[PDB]
Design a protein around this ligand. Structure first.
Ligand SMILES: OC[C@H]1O[C@H](O[C@H]2[C@H](O)[C@@H](O)[C@@H](O[C@H]3[C@H](O)[C@@H](O)[C@@H](O[C@H]4[C@H](O)[C@@H](O)[C@@H](O)O[C@@H]4CO)O[C@@H]3CO)O[C@@H]2CO)[C@H](O)[C@@H](O)[C@@H]1O
Ligand SMILES: OC[C@H]1O[C@H](O[C@H]2[C@H](O)[C@@H](O)[C@@H](O[C@H]3[C@H](O)[C@@H](O)[C@@H](O[C@H]4[C@H](O)[C@@H](O)[C@@H](O)O[C@@H]4CO)O[C@@H]3CO)O[C@@H]2CO)[C@H](O)[C@@H](O)[C@@H]1O
Length: 97
C-alpha cells in the first residue's frame, strides 16, 4: 500500500531556472541519484505530493537543482520520515531537522 506525503519548504531562488527537489534512500525518492522536483506557489513556498510506501521509514533531503544537477544539498544530516498510512503534510525548514 501507498501513502501520499506533501513536502513543503520555503526557499527564495535567485533565478528562474533553479528549483527545489526532494531525494532520498527509497526507490520512490530516487535512491540519492535522481530527485523529485517540487513546484513553486504563492508566498515563496515549494510544495509537491509524492506517493511513498505505507508504514515504513525512509531517509531524505531537500536539494537545490540547476542545469540538470544538484548544486546545493541541505546542510543537515539525512532526515528520517515514518511514512504512516494517512495522507499528510511534511512542513520543514531548510537545513533544520
Ligand atoms: O555508497 C554510496 C552511499 O550512498 C548513500 O550516501 C548518500 C548520503 O546518505 C546522502 O546524504 C547524500 O550525500 C550527500 C550529502 O547529503 C551532502 O551533504 C553532500 O555531502 C558532502 C558535503 O557537501 C561536504 O561535507 C563534502 O565534504 O563531502 C560530503 C560528502 O561527499 O553530498 C553528498 C552526496 O555527494 O547522498 C549520498 C550518496 O550519493 C548511503 O547513505 C551511504 O551509506 C553510501 O556510502
Ligand atoms: O541563528 C540561526 C539564524 O537565525 C536567523 O535565521 C532565520 C531566518 O531569518 C529566517 O528567515 C528563517 O530562515 C529560513 C528562510 O526563511 C528560508 O527562506 C530558507 O532560507 C534560504 C533562502 O531562502 C535561500 O535564498 C538561500 O539563501 O538559503 C537559505 C537557507 O540557507 O531557509 C531558512 C532557514 O533554513 O529561519 C532562520 C533560522 O532558522 C538569522 O537571521 C540567521 O542569521 C541565523 O544564522
Amino acid at each position: 500500500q501507498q501513502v501520499s506525503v506533501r513536502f513543503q519548504v520555503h526557499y527564495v531562488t535567485s533565478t528562474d531556472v533553479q528549483f527545489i527537489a526532494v531525494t532520498g534512500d527509497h526507490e520512490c525518492l530516487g535512491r540519492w541519484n535522481t530527485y523529485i522536483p517540487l513546484h513553486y506557489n504563492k508566498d515563496g513556498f515549494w510544495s509537491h505530493s509524492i506517493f511513498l510506501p505505507a508504514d515504513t521509514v525512509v531517509e531524505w533531503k531537500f536539494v537545490l537543482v540547476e542545469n540538470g544537477g544538484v548544486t546545493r544539498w541541505e546542510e543537515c544530516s539525512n532526515r528520517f520520515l515514518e511514512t504512516g498510512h494517512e495522507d499528510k503534510v511534511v512542513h520543514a525548514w531548510w537545513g533544520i531537522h
